[PDB]
Each structure stands twice: as structure tokens, then as C-alpha cells.
Amino acid sequence: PGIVELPSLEDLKVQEVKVSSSVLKAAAHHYGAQCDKPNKEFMLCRWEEKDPRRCLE
Amino acid sequence: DGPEKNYERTMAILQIEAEKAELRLKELEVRRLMRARGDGPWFHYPTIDKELIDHSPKATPDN
């Protein structure tokens, strides 16, 4: 067994979406339409790589 | 029966019996190797069938 490679804590800093669940619920339908492209690319990366370390960008 | 008929009938019996005796010994050798290595049709015990596996995308990604 080898060492599990992990990204650094600085590889994980991003501006978080600090709104509550009722805010996301309200905007969800317009959000899904407007932000489909990067969202679907990430989920394609996500179901193909099967590894969260491979889709961080 | 003349001596020749009995003589050459005896060889026919000996050939048949010798062939069987050889095959009996080879079978015990084949059985020994098949059971020890499991690389033949005999002593082949089943394993789960890979065709029972579901390959479609799942609810969650990491799998």
C-alpha cells in the first residue's frame, strides 16, 4: 500500500456560496438553467473519474 | 480352435487391455493435476457470474 495522495489545504480554498437552503431553493430553477454548462461538465468529470481529487478544478 | 486363432485372438485381448490400463493411469494423473491447479474442466467450482453486475451510472459518483 502507498500513501493516499491528497490535495493541499491551499488547493481547496474557493469562495463559498454562503446562502441558506431556502435561498438556493428559491433560485434553483433559474440557477439550473443559467449555470448548466459548468455544472454538467463537473458532474461528467465526477461520474467518469469516480475520484473527487480529479475534478477539483 | 487352431493355435493361430487363439494366439492372435490373445494379442487382440492384450492390446485392448493394455490400452485401457494406460488410460486408467493417465486419468489418475489428469485428475491429480486438475484438482491441484484447477485449470481444467474438472473440479471447476463456480464463481459469481460477472453478468449479474450493474454497470449503469449510479445515484452517487464514487463507484
UniProtKB/Swiss-Prot annotation, chain A:
Motif (Cx9C motif 1): 35-45
Positions spanned in the full protein: 2 to 58 of 172
Assembly and interaction partners: Complex I is composed of 45 different subunits.
Top-rank taxon: Eukaryota
Function of the protein: Accessory subunit of the mitochondrial membrane respiratory chain NADH dehydrogenase (Complex I), that is believed not to be involved in catalysis. Complex I functions in the transfer of electrons from NADH to the respiratory chain. The immediate electron acceptor for the enzyme is believed to be ubiquinone.
Disulfide pairings: 45-55
GO biological process: mitochondrial electron transport, NADH to ubiquinone
Record key words, sorted: Disulfide bond, Electron transport, Membrane, Mitochondrion, Mitochondrion inner membrane, Repeat, Respiratory chain, Transport
Name of this chain's protein: NADH dehydrogenase [ubiquinone] 1 alpha subcomplex subunit 8
Cell compartment(s), UniProt: Mitochondrion inner membrane; Mitochondrion intermembrane space; Mitochondrion
Species the sequence originates in: Bos taurus (Bovine)
Residue ranges of domain CHCH in the record: 32-57
One GO CC term on file: mitochondrial intermembrane space
Family named by the database record: Belongs to the complex I NDUFA8 subunit family.
Curated annotation (Swiss-Prot), chain B:
Localization of this protein: Mitochondrion inner membrane
Family: Belongs to the complex I NDUFB5 subunit family.
Function text: Accessory subunit of the mitochondrial membrane respiratory chain NADH dehydrogenase (Complex I), that is believed not to be involved in catalysis. Complex I functions in the transfer of electrons from NADH to the respiratory chain. The immediate electron acceptor for the enzyme is believed to be ubiquinone.
Organism, as annotated: Bos taurus
Shown segment, full-protein numbering: 127 to 189 of 189
UniProt-recorded name of the protein: NADH dehydrogenase [ubiquinone] 1 beta subcomplex subunit 5, mitochondrial
Signal peptide (residue range): none
Assembly description: Complex I is composed of 45 different subunits.
